[PDB]
Every structure is written in structure tokens, then in C-alpha cells.
Design brief:
The structure is cut from a larger assembly and holds chains A (71 residues) and B (1338 residues). With 71 residues, chain A is an all-alpha fold. Chain A has a single domain, classed as Eukaryotic RPB6 RNA polymerase subunit. Helix content of chain A is 61%, strand content 0%. In chain A, helix 1 crosses helix 3 and helix 2 packs across helix 3. The longest helix of chain A is centred in the first third of the chain and has 14 residues. The N and C termini of chain A lie far apart (34 Å). Chain B is an alpha+beta fold and 1338 residues long. Chain B has a six-stranded mixed sheet. In chain B, strands 24-31-30-27-26 form a five-stranded antiparallel sheet, with no helix packed on it. In chain B, strands 2-3-6 form a three-stranded mixed sheet. The chains are: A mainly alpha (71), B alpha+beta (1338). Bound molecules: magnesium ion and zinc ion (2 copies). One zinc ion binds next to loops of chain B. Chain B: DNA-dependent RNA polymerase catalyzes the transcription of DNA into RNA using the four ribonucleoside triphosphates as substrates. Chain B: InterPro entries: DNA-dir_RpoC_beta_prime (IPR045867), DNA-dir_RpoC_beta_prime_bact (IPR012754), RNA_pol_asu (IPR000722), RNA_pol_N (IPR006592), RNA_pol_Rpb1_1 (IPR007080), RNA_pol_Rpb1_3 (IPR007066), RNA_pol_Rpb1_3_sf (IPR042102), RNA_pol_Rpb1_4 (IPR007083).
């Protein structure tokens, strides 16, 4: 379970930066080998990236910090 | 990676740079071998190679040879795809003039040389001579020479004379154009003239000179000496079946030019005379002209073919150009289509997809999953596994579609909800299983309709389908605030039968300890579905902020209403399910559930209502039979009585008592009365027929009838359809527009006759043929609305303005048809509202009014509110987020980047397919307050009104206006001001037949010049029925007395002169024709004397003509300045409507026609916003005389009146959004600072007023005035030329943008679509924002 699109969009309330924030995080979980903070519940990286937005684990500065350590 | 796509004229030095070689021979290929010949239209040396990495000879055919070019017969080794990019050029021996810059609406060559279009066409055809550098000769450069006049020029002058003829002369006239000198001559000769016939000619010629100076385009480039050659792959010569070849219409055109160019080059070296060489150069003109464009003065070649030809310009114009064909459609991959099918077991976020379609749509995703899992080594082996349909492939397909959404769209996409995303599941069959609840937004029935599918590939598009385009996200309508996903007729039927209280049923009066005991008693068959019981319920209340407190109470409800409360979320009370659950009651519950518990608990609640409605509608086997259409037993007593009342009239028609028209209105109004009498007697017998027995009785309850339940619950059917099944059908219409005398007295249960059935076919095919126009006219309206409001998008978060329009409820009539509850819901306040007290405000500042603030304003007596609107916003190139509001599919306000201009045009064009005074009396009881009505109290106790700009209002005890009535001039007022009115009694009386008059002061007044022989005539009725001074017509007057007019002179009783205050001239008013004088000569009343009595389209085309701001067929006449108006001369042919301003010294005289019957009189002062003559008024003069606040009120309320009549409802933000783009251009009244007399945009006029004010200039005398443009003229004002070439003419917008060097940017929506870039609206705003801060900054 844990599929909430309104809970993740309740904090930002833009519905446009959420798609941009989840895009930069979905590629890290698919390419590069980044381990997600939430558990793998047999979900695709596109949906499991939205769980970290609703739970507040990742943010705008969290994705930028995790990608800068790899470069 | 590119920006600012610029366009300009092509120089001969740049045309040679695009080309890779010159073509010299006109052939294409060899007859024996199919190889491109050298120096031809198809040549592998100039263009690219034919085969991949291989020349024509074959010396180099490998990858290691790229820059090596063979010398014997080979070509440059390339990828064989450069044949689309390589170009050629033909160096013409004689110059040719471009027809695009010659044959258009403006003469680009004529205005540049001060020459006529016909005269230039005369020199280009070698018929007349022109003079170059006349100088000291006897003729002017504008004077032409003939064949006999040119020979004389070389005899008298000899020296200082040079004359040419043909295209070389036009090329020479543009060499010495003196661009830096001609502008200096036009600047010193423009202010000398004063006639407007020469201002528009010299200014239009001046603006073209500065265009050729700053852009860099030289006037010499308008005529070309070398033309480019289209690449060969764009004009393909491909073979067909059977050895037949097929070429394009440009190869024979390119061959015809080369055939004539080489013939002219050979005719020059043979020393041929001028008689033969002037005709060959003339043929080369129309040879290149027919290649560029067709349809001009040069007729295109037509050989062995019906259609004339397809030239170069015909490929980008003519409703079939390559630029316009792609804007209306483009085939895509990863798509498919199939019929739709209802699936009642699916969730709201998922749909059914066949296995045969999922294998083809997700084919690339399976090939990548088979290699990653280890089932296939290569992609060639993985493809063969799908063709065999191996069992292990189904396990892979089930994993690639688990979280991958797909897009479904119906063919007619009228609004935004036409495309929604679903999670596909694998189903067995060939039909797409659709959810029953999403069928209302799609407007899709199960009659064989098809639905297209699409697969988003990138994860950027997959996140947009889940977060934006999901079916669970767009649960509310984008046009209103009401839910669009509501239970349809089949679900609302099961919820209505379940919650339907009965009088006596099984298990009535028993008590239940909880809701689980109710289901346990119903499933055992020991309790009816609807019986009066008492059940203890534990509910939770969300009314407290952050406190979900539970309450346990004992309620008195039925069994079915208790089972329905099991699916209701915890935040809602029980009083929401104690009703009968009609369709209008369920939609209001889903809307209330969305604002309390949110969205997650609502998408799972709308699915429970569909499961509960489908379950309890099947248990009750409702069915329609022949006995369900009950017929009232009193229908025969009304039809037989109405038939006898017409027989007594037909006898009077044969006796001569009534006429044909008098009998028509008698029998039409008679059957209309009997039709309503049967309808009210049918619904009374249909609704209260079910009888029951309670401990012994005959009690009447609501009818448990199948035909009554389907109409009461709102599932399907209305009062107009049940009327034709049980009651009489009534009177039928006619395509001519009249009503037939004989009605249809039979219904569909009893059956119709042969003549009664043929009559009903008139209105049947009239409504069916009307639907063909409803899809052609409304589709043309929603397309014009998008072309205007496409660039409008939310860009700024806060504008910082305080301007706004006032919002008041519609109090027209008896009650408010649309109160302030829904007119202010979702709009930010502009100014702080004040209580009747002092220093007490309701709202603190500009705040978003939600459902919690609507009730806070209903408790108070606040009636007016100043809200923000897009038509009053100050954000340049966009619209503010705070000025829009929160009326959308979301609960919060609009976000930055939302294209609010496209959702506004789709909200108006979607419901377009559904579109086609003697006395006043106060209805309710309250105080009477009059505003802007200056009255004079008489001696009897009555009031007389002299102005018409005001109206009468009914003040409620709280302090709110709920009734507004309009009063004509001279309307006698019965009640006073500040008293309690009587509900049902009159308050004022009027006279719509004869316009009354008013007197300023009392005195012995007598008619001057009334000899009763020429001017007036003493008329007497029968038995002294008329004893007054009756006026006569102007046509009946004599020829000598026609100049003199009867006038009344007001004099006081003492003999002194009486003059009205504020006006020098006394109150001397002339009596018009057809007037009666009640007061005698020398005796009148104290006040209120009527000296003279003056006697007296809808639907879809109405909304279309209202957005265009068209002038009606009979425009109304309004006043300009507030002053005393007067008449002029009537025997001349017109009417001089002179008026003297009483407050200011500025007389303004205007003329008026005589066929338009005026309603104003002589000697009455009129205001600025007062209407003189009756009739519809165009929205143009209402903007100038009143302003923009009155225009936004008249346009919105007039468009809503067309939509509110049909039942649909659209928010006011969508009409004010389109109105913002129409009120965009401005016009200057005075000249001196602008270029021409016309106006420019208000965004450019405002940015120039701030630099001129806080600069070298002190004042800003360059003022302006607001103008209104239609949805057709406002769309033409587009700074871009890429997007302007779509809906406008292509060949007209390309010649204008070329001569000015218009560098077009891509800061819009329509430009980035055909180019291929991201759109600035939506998620693409982050791409255009990250580039602006890195281009103009660091
Ligand atoms: Mg259908
Ligand atoms: Zn070769
Ligand atoms: Zn604003």
C-alpha cells in the first residue's frame, strides 16, 4: 500500500514542483543505484519516489545533497 | 537550444551559401538505369548520395571513407539522409520580381517607390519605359515614356538621360532609393497636409522606410537574380507497382524554369535583336512566378490534369498546407482504440485493458524486461517469444503495467476531462472496460463508442499522469465547484429505493443497539428494507477544529438509511443520510465530503456508493410495465369539455363575430390551459396513489411506482417526458414557427393516429437536424476563444493592487436567483468590508473566501463585496494568482504556471452543444428605499418621478435589498419613503401606453399659437367622450403653418417671469404630435401636470455575437454630457439633438435619424448614463460613456442569462478571463507622440508613460482611451509570426514579417508546439525559468 498523491501534494500545494521533485528522485532510484529511504513494497521507482515526499524524508535540498555526493 | 527564430529577406550572396551546387540541365534520371544524372534536379554530386555510404560509381562504399570524394563518377560519401538538407541554386540571366512582395493587399514595391501596382506590372512586362536619374531633363521620375515618346528624348537632350525597361529597371530604381535621405523628406512633408485621405497614405509609406533600415534588409533584395532549389527528398520521384513512376508538382515547375533560363542564356550570345529577346525575358517572369505561388495574374500550367497545380506557396497555405495540416492532427505511436464496456468491479483509478492490446502497446517494455531477467540474450530472440505467446511472457507483461498508467480519450474532446489516466488491468476480451462513474465526464454511452489509448513513455510523463491527469485527481469540474464524478441513473436508483420511508412494513417499531444489528436483522429476512425503527448510532463530528469527538445518540430512522451510514466517513454526521437521497442530494453530499475529510477518504467513498447503489437496485427488481403509465380517470372529462368549448367558437367564426386572428389566439390559449389541467391532475394521481393499512385504516403515502421513482429520484426522465407517456402530448410546433390548432390529445401508451404521428415528425427532424449545427457552430466558438486567451497564464504570485469590481446578488424579480453565496465563493476580497458600525471590519485584508467565510457573511447584513478579477489585474504579460481565486478542480487557489486561459475557453465551449409593465407590485414585506431618484412632493400626497436613472428597492429588516423594480418617467408613486410596505399591494403606478409629462412650477399656462386650424385640431368624441386640447400630426399641418410649432409658455400667477434654477432659458417646451392637454388654458394643478402625452436573438448565435462585440441591428441612442437636451429642425430630414450642459461650458451637437422613434422630449435634463431611444445597445458606447466596471457587468450578466436558461452553470471567472484579452488594446485620442493615428497595446503604452514622466519631459499629454475588440480582431494582434500563420492567412503574415526582420521569440504556447519545445504553462515553467536566469544573468 502507501500510495497517497494528495498527502505528498498537501505540503507543497503546487502540483508542478512535486512532479519535478519526484522526477529527480525517480532517476536516482533507477539509475546510479541509490537506495530509497522507504522500504521496497514491490513498487516501481516512479511511485516509491512519491512516498518519500509524503513522509517528508526527502526535500529539495535532500535530493541535491544526495546527488552531489556521487559526483 | 535555440531561441529568437528570426526571418528576413534573402540576399543573393546568402542564397549561394545555402546551395552546394548549381543545376544546369533540366532532366532528372536516366531512362535505362535509375540513377541521378549530373547537373540536374536529381544529382548526387550537388545533393547527398542515394544509397547509404556509397557513391554513384562505387569506388568508396565503406564507413572508413567519409571525407574522401571520388573523382571519376563518385560523390561525397554521406549518410544518404542529407538529401533533405542539401539545396541548389539557378543563376538566372535576367532578374525576376517576387510576386509575394508585389501582389498583396499592400504594395511592398509600389509603396517603396511611390508607384502604382498596375503601373509596375506594365514595366515588368516590357511595355512602357521608365526614367532613371532624370535630373535636368523635361520629365519627372514618375512620368513614363512610350514607344513613340522615348525616341524623342534622345534627340532634344542627348546628355543626362538614362531609361530602362523590364526587371532591370525596377532593380535600378531600388539601387538609389536613398534610404537615409527619403525618411528626411517624408518627415518635413507630413505635417503640412490636413486631410485624412493623405495622412493614412504618407504614414503607411513612412513606417515601411524605417523597417528596411533597422532590420538590415536592403530594398535591392525584393527582386532576385538567383533562386534556391528545393531538396530532392522533399519532392520525391519514387517508383510504383509495375515500373510506373510518380513525381511531384515541383519537378515540372523547376524543369520549366531551367528550360527557359538556358534558352535565354543562349539567345544573348547570338546577338539577337531586342524584338525577340524581350519576349524571352518576359516568359522567364511567369515561369518563376508560377513556381512560387499560383492563383495570381500568371495562370498556372494545366496539362492533362483537372486541378491547376501545386506550387511552393500552395504547400503552406490553402487549408492543406504542411504548417496547418500538422496543427489539426498528427499520428502517434504506442496507441490504439477499441469499444468501451462497463465494468462495475473496477476502482476509480483503474480501467480494463485487453491482453492483445497490452502486448502491442507495451512491446518495448517487454523486450527490456526479458533481457534484464535473463530469459532472452538478444532482442531478436526476445521478439520471437512474443509472437509465440509463451506462458512466461504473461508474467512479464503483468509486471510492466503494475504502476504504469495509460491515457484514455474519447473522439470529441470538448473540455479538459476528455483525457484521463487510469491504471490498466489485464482482462479477457477485446473491449475496453470503463468505469461507470467516469462516464459522465467523458460523455460516453455504451452504444458502440470507441476510446483511444495512449502510453506515456518517460517517467516525467508517468508522474504527470499520476499527479495531474489521474481520474481520482479531477473529481471536481474545472468550470464550477460541483463534483463531476457523481452517481448516475443506475446508482442513484438503488440509493433512492433504499432510503425511502414507508408507512407500514415488516419489522416496524423495533429498536437496534447498533448499526451491525440492523444488517443482521435485514439479512435474515425479518425486517423490511425501509421500516420506521430506532437505532443507536456512534458518530464523529469534524465541526470542531482539530477535534474528532465521538457522540452516541438514539435516532428515529429507517432500516435502509442505517445501512447507508456504514459507508459514510467519520467526519460527517447522520443527518446527511436521513433524507430520500435524490440525485441533487447526493451531489451535495460528495461536495460536502470533499471539503471536510479531504480527497483520500472521498475517492474510497464514491466507490462505496457505486457498490451500494448497484447492490440494492438489483435486489429490488424495478421494472416498467404497461400498467405503470397510469391514466387519470378525469382526463376524459377535460378533453371532452375542451372539445365542446371549441365547437361553440367555430359557430361564431361562421357568423362573423370573430376574425381569423382572434379565433387563432382563442383556440391556442384554450388547449394550453387544458394541457396544464391534465398535467396537474396526472401528477396528483401518480404521486399519492399508494395506500397502506396501519392497525386498520386507509392512509395515503407516497407512490411506490416505477415510473414515479425514476422521475422523483432524478435518475432518468423529467416532467416533460412523463407528461407524454400518461397525460396528453399537447400542441406540436411547426418548422415555419407557428402552432397547429389541433393538438395531440393522445399519449404514447394509448397510441397516436396516422395524422397525429405525422404532425410529431415536424419537430422530430427539426431537432435532429439542429444537432448538426450545434457541433459545427459551438466548435467554431470554442476554437476562436482559445486563439485569444491561449497566452494568458498565471505567472505572478501577488500583484499588489486594490482595484476590483463590486459584486451584488441578482435581485431582479421577486427573490434572488443567484445570491452572494456562490457569486463570492472562491474570490479574494479587494477592500476591507465594513459593518454598519464604526471601526469594525469582517475581513482583515484580501483573503480567500472559502465555505467557512460564506456563512460568516450570511449571518451578517453584508450585501456588497469588492473582489479581485482578471479584468482589473495589473500584471503585465500574464495574470496574478491572487486575482484569479480558487474555482477549479482543486480546493486551494491557483498555482503559478496553470494555464487559466485555456480552461476558461473550454469551460464556455463545452456546454455550447446544449444551447439553441403597467404597474409595479412589491411581493414581500419590508422598507422601501429609493436611490438616485429625485422626486417632487405634490399637494395631494403623491410623488412624481422626473429621472429614470434610479429604481425602487425593498429594504429588509436586516438591511439587505431583495427586490428591485424599474420605474418609467412620470410614474406616480403611491407610498412614501421609509415606511413598511404591504406584501401584495401596489407601491407605484406607471403608464406604458402614453408617456406622461412633468411641470416645474404652477401657474396659468396656455397654448401659444394654437389656432385649432393649422397647428392643432379640436377633437370631440361620441357623447362628449373627449373634451380636451388634442394635438395634430405634422403631416396633417398646412404648408404655411408647418414652420410654426405649438409651444406652452409657463407664467406665474402674479405675472412675473419664472426661470428654472441652473438654466438661463425658461421652461418653454413645445408640444409634439398626438398629444392631449388635460389642463385648460389658464388653470392647472399645483404639481404633476401631464400637459402632453407622448404615445408609444437567443441561444448559441447569441453568445457568439456577444463575444464579437457586434453592433445590433438597431443600436440605442445614449447621452454624452449631463445636460438639458433639446430638439432641432424636423422638416430638413434629420433631427438636430442639441444639448446645453448645465454644469460645464462645453456644447456638443450630434445628429440622429428620423426613422428611429425617439423616447425623449423637449426641455428635460438627461444624465450621462441615461438612455434616450429604446433598443439594444452595443458594448462599445457603454465602455466609453460609463467605463470598464459597467462593461464587465453587462457582458457577464448577458452571457449567463443564455446559459442559466438551459440549466447549465459556468463560473464568472471564465467570462472575465476572456474579457481581459478583449480589453487589451488601447487607442490614443490626440496625436503628436504616437506614430500613426491608430492605437497600440496597453502594456507598451504604460511602460512608455513612466519613462516620459520621470525623465526629460514633465507632463504626460499623450493620453489614451479604452477600446473593445472581438474574439476575432483581438486574436490578430500577435507579436509572433509563427503562431500567427496558423489561424490567419499564411502568405500575408510571412511577407510582412520578412520585410521588417521580425525576430520571433518562443514565449507562448502555440509557438512551442509546432517548434517542438516545452510550453511555458504547467510543468514546463521550470524549464523556461532556469534558462532566463542563466541567459540574462550569471
Ligand atoms: Mg453512443
Ligand atoms: Zn564513385
Ligand atoms: Zn493581480
Amino acid at each position: 500500500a502507501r500510495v497517497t498523491v494528495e498527502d505528498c501534494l498537501d505540503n507543497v500545494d503546487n502540483r508542478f514542483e512535486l512532479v519535478m521533485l519526484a522526477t529527480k528522485r525517480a532517476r536516482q532510484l533507477a539509475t546510479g543505484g541509490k537506495e530509497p529511504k522507504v522500504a521496497w513494497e514491490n513498487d516501481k521507482p516512479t511511485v516509491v519516489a512519491l512516498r518519500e515526499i509524503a513522509s517528508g524524508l526527502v526535500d529539495e535540498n535532500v535530493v541535491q545533497q544526495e546527488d552531489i555526493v556521487e559526483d | 537550444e535555440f531561441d529568437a527564430i528570426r526571418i528576413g529577406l534573402a540576399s543573393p550572396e546568402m542564397i549561394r551559401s545555402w546551395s552546394f551546387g548549381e543545376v544546369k540541365k533540366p532532366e532528372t534520371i536516366n531512362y535505362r538505369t535509375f540513377k541521378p544524372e549530373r547537373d540536374g534536379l536529381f544529382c548526387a554530386k550537388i545533393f547527398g548520395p542515394v544509397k547509404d555510404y556509397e557513391c554513384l560509381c562505387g569506388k568508396y562504399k565503406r564507413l572508413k571513407h567519409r571525407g574522401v570524394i571520388c573523382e571519376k563518377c563518385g560523390v561525397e560519401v554521406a549518410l544518404a539522409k542529407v538529401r533533405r538538407e542539401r539545396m541548389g541554386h539557378i543563376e538566372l540571366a535576367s532578374p525576376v520580381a517576387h510576386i509575394w512582395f508585389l501582389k498583396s493587399l499592400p504594395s511592398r514595391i509600389g509603396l517603396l517607390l511611390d508607384m502604382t501596382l498596375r503601373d509596375i506590372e506594365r514595366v515588368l512586362y516590357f511595355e512602357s519605359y521608365v526614367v532613371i536619374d532624370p535630373g535636368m531633363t523635361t520629365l519627372e521620375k514618375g512620368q513614363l515614356l512610350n514607344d513613340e515618346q522615348y525616341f524623342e528624348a534622345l534627340e532634344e537632350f542627348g546628355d543626362d538621360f538614362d531609361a530602362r525597361m523590364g526587371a532591370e529597371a525596377v532593380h535600378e530604381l531600388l539601387n538609389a532609393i536613398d534610404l537615409e535621405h527619403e525618411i528626411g523628406r517624408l518627415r518635413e512633408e507630413i505635417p503640412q497636409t490636413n486631410s485624412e485621405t493623405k495622412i493614412k497614405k504618407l504614414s503607411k509609406r513612412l513606417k515601411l522606410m524605417e523597417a528596411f533600415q533597422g532590420s538590415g534588409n536592403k530594398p535591392e533584395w525584393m527582386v532576385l537574380t538567383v533562386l534556391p532549389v528545393l531538396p530532392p527528398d522533399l519532392r520525391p520521384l519514387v517508383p510504383l507497382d509495375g515500373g510506373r513512376f510518380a513525381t511531384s508538382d515541383l519537378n515540372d515547375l523547376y524543369r520549366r524554369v531551367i528550360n527557359r533560363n538556358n534558352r535565354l542564356k543562349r539567345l544573348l550570345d547570338l546577338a539577337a535583336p531586342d524584338i525577340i529577346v524581350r519576349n524571352e525575358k518576359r516568359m522567364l517572369q511567369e515561369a518563376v512566378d508560377a513556381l512560387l505561388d499560383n492563383g495570381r495574374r500568371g495562370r498556372a500550367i494545366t496539362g492533362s490534369n483537372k486541378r491547376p497545380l501545386k506550387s511552393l506557396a500552395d504547400m503552406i497555405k490553402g487549408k492543406q498546407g504542411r504548417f496547418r495540416q500538422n496543427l489539426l492532427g498528427k499520428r502517434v505511436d504506442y496507441s490504439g482504440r477499441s469499444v468501451i464496456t462497463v465494468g462495475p468491479t473496477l476502482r476509480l483509478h483503474q480501467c480494463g485493458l485487453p491482453k492483445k492490446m497490452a502486448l502491442e502497446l507495451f512491446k518495448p517494455f517487454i523486450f527490456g524486461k526479458l533481457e534484464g531477467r535473463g530469459m532472452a540474450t538478444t532482442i531478436k530472440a526476445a521478439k520471437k517469444m512474443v509472437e509465440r505467446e509463451l506462458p512466461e511472457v504473461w508474467d512479464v507483461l503483468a509486471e510492466v503495467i503494475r504502476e504504469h498508467p495509460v491515457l484514455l480519450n474519447r473522439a470529441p474532446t470538448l473540455h479538459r476531462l476528455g483525457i484521463q489516466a487510469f491504471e490498466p488491468v489485464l482482462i479477457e476480451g477485446k473491449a475496453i472496460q470503463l468505469h461507470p462513474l467516469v462516464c459522465a465526464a467523458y460523455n460516453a454511452d455504451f452504444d458502440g463508442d470507441q476510446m483511444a489509448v495512449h502510453v506515456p513513455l518517460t517517467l516525467e510523463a508517468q508522474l504527470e499522469a499520476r499527479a495531474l491527469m489521474m481520474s481520482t485527481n479531477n473529481i471536481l469540474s474545472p468550470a464550477n465547484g460541483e463534483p463531476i464524478i457523481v452517481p448516475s441513473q443506475d446508482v442513484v436508483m438503488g440509493l433512492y429505493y433504499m432510503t425511502r420511508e414507508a408507512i407500514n412494513a415488516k419489522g416496524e417499531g423495533m429498536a437496534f443497539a447498533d448499526l451491525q444489528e440492523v444488517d443482521r436483522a435485514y439479512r435474515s429476512g425479518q425486517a423490511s428494507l425501509h421500516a420506521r425503527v430506532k437505532v443507536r448510532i456512534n458518530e464523529k463530528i469534524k465541526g470542531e477544529d482539530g477535534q474528532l469527538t465521538a457522540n452516541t445518540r438514539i435516532v428515529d430512522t429507517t432500516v435502509g438509511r442505517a445501512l447507508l451510514f456504514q459507508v459514510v466517513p467519520a467526519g460527517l454526521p447522520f443527518d446527511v443520510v436521513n433524507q430520500s437521497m435524490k440525485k441533487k442530494a447526493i451531489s451535495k453530499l460528495i461536495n460536502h465530503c470533499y471539503r471536510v475529510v479531504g480527497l483520500k477518504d472521498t475517492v474510497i467513498f464514491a466507490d462505496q456508493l457505486m457498490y451500494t447503489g448497484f447492490a440494492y437496485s438489483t435486489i429490488s427488481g424495478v421494472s416498467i410495465g404497461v400498467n405503470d403509465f397510469v391514466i387519470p380517470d378525469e382526463k376524459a372529462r377535460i378533453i371532452n369539455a375542451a372539445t365542446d368549448e371549441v365547437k361553440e367558437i367555430e359557430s361564431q367564426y361562421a357568423s362573423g363575430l370573430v376574425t381569423q386572428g382572434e379565433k387563432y389566439n382563442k383556440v391556442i390559449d384554450l388547449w394550453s390551459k387544458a394541457n396544464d389541467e391534465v398535467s396537474k391532475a396526472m401528477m396528483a394521481n401518480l404521486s399519492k396513489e399508494k395506500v397502506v393499512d396501519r392497525e386498520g385504516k386507509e392512509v395515503d403515502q407516497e407512490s411506490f411506482n416505477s415510473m414515479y421513482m425514476m422521475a422523483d429520484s432524478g435518475a432518468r426522465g423529467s416532467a416533460a417526458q412523463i407528461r407524454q407517456l400518461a397525460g396528453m402530448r399537447g400542441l406540436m410546433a411547426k418548422p415555419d414557427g407557428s402552432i397547429i390548432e389541433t393538438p395531440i390529445t393522445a399519449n404514447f401508451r394509448e397510441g397516436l393516429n396516422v395524422l397525429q404521428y405525422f404532425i410529431s415528425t415536424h419537430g422530430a427532424r427539426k431537432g435532429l437536424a439542429d444537432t448538426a449545427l450545434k457541433t459545427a457552430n459551438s466548435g467554431y466558438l470554442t476554437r476562436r476563444l482559445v486563439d485569444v486567451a491561449q497566452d494568458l497564464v498565471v505567472t505572478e504570485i501577488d500583484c499588489g493592487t486594490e482595484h476590483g469590481l463590486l459584486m451584488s446578488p441578482h435581485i431582479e424579480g421577486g427573490d434572488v436567483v443567484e445570491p452572494l453565496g456562490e457569486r463570492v465563493l472562491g474570490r479574494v476580497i479587494a477592500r476591507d468590508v465594513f459593518k454598519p458600525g464604526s471601526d469594525e471590519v469582517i475581513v482583515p485584508a484580501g483573503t480567500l473566501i472559502d465555505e467557512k467565510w460564506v456563512d460568516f457573511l450570511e449571518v451578517m447584513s453584508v450585501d456588497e463585496v469588492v473582489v479581485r478579477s482578471p479584468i482589473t489585474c495589473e500584471t503585465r504579460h500574464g495574470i496574478c494568482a491572487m486575482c484569479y481565486g480558487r474555482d477549479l478542480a482543486r480546493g486551494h487557489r491557483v498555482n503559478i504556471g496553470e494555464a487559466v486561459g485555456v480552461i476558461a475557453a473550454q469551460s464556455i465551449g463545452e456546454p455550447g452543444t446544449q444551447l439553441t409593465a403597467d404597474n409595479v407590485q412589491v411581493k414581500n414585506g419590508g422598507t422601501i428605499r429609493l436611490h438616485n431618484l429625485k422626486h417632487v412632493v405634490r399637494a395631494d400626497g403623491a410623488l412624481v418621478a422626473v429621472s429614470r436613472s434610479g429604481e425602487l428597492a425593498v429594504a429588509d429588516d436586516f438591511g439587505r435589498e431583495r427586490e428591485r423594480y424599474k420605474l418609467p418617467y412620470g410614474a406616480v408613486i403611491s407610498v412614501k419613503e421609509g415606511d413598511k410596505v404591504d406584501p401584495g399591494a401596489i407601491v407605484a403606478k406607471w403608464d406604458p401606453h402614453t408617456h406622461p409629462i412633468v411641470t416645474e412650477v404652477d401657474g396659468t399656462v396656455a397654448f401659444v399659437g394654437m389656432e385649432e386650424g393649422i397647428t392643432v385640431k379640436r377633437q370631440t368624441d361620441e357623447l362628449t367622450g373627449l373634451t380636451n386640447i388634442e394635438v395634430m400630426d405634422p403631416k396633417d399641418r398646412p404648408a404655411a403653418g408647418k414652420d410654426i410649432r405649438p409651444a406652452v409658455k409657463l407664467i406665474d400667477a402674479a405675472g412675473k417671469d419664472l426661470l428654472l434654477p441652473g438654466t438661463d432659458v425658461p421652461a418653454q417646451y413645445f408640444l409634439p404630435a398626438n398629444a392631449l392637454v388635460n389642463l385648460t388654458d389658464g388653470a392647472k394643478v399645483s404639481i404633476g401636470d401631464v400637459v402632453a402625452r407622448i404615445p408609444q436573438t437567443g441561444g448559441l448565435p447569441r453568445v457568439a455575437d456577444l463575444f464579437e462585440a457586434r453592433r445590433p441591428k438597431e443600436p440605442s441612442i445614449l447621452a454624452e454630457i449631463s445636460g438639458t437636451i433639446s430638439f432641432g429642425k424636423e422638416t430638413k430630414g434629420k433631427r438636430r439633438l442639441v444639448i446645453t450642459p448645465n454644469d460645464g461650458s462645453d456644447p456638443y451637437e450630434e445628429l440622429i435619424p428620423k426613422w428611429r422613434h425617439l423616447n425623449v422630449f423637449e426641455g428635460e435634463q438627461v444624465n450621462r448614463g441615461e438612455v434616450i431611444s429604446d433598443g439594444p445597445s452595443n458594448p462599445h458606447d457603454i465602455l466609453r460613456l460609463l467605463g470598464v466596471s459597467s462593461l464587465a457587468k453587462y457582458i457577464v450578466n448577458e452571457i449567463q442569462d443564455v446559459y442559466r436558461l438551459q440549466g447549465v452553470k459556468i463560473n464568472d471567472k471564465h467570462i472575465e478571463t476572456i474579457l481581459r484579452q478583449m480589453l487589451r488594446k488601447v487607442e490614443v485620442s490626440e496625436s503628436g507622440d504616437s506614430s500613426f493615428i491608430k492605437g497600440d497595446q496597453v502594456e507598451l503604452t504604460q511602460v512608455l508613460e513612466e519613462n516620459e514622466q520621470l525623465g526629460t519631459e514633465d507632463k504626460f499629454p499623450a493620453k489614451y482611451e479604452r477600446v473593445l475588440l472581438g474574439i476575432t480582431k483581438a486574436s490578430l494582434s500577435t507579436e509572433s509570426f509563427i503562431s500567427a500563420a496558423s489561424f490567419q492567412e499564411t502568405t500575408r503574415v510571412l511577407t510582412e514579417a520578412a520585410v521588417t526582420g521580425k525576430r520571433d521569440f518562443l514565449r507562448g504556447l502555440k509557438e512551442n508546439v509546432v517548434v517542438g519545445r516545452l510550453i511555458p504553462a504547467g510543468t514546463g515553467l521550470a524549464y523556461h525559468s532556469e534558462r532566463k536566469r542563466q541567459r540574462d544573468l550569471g
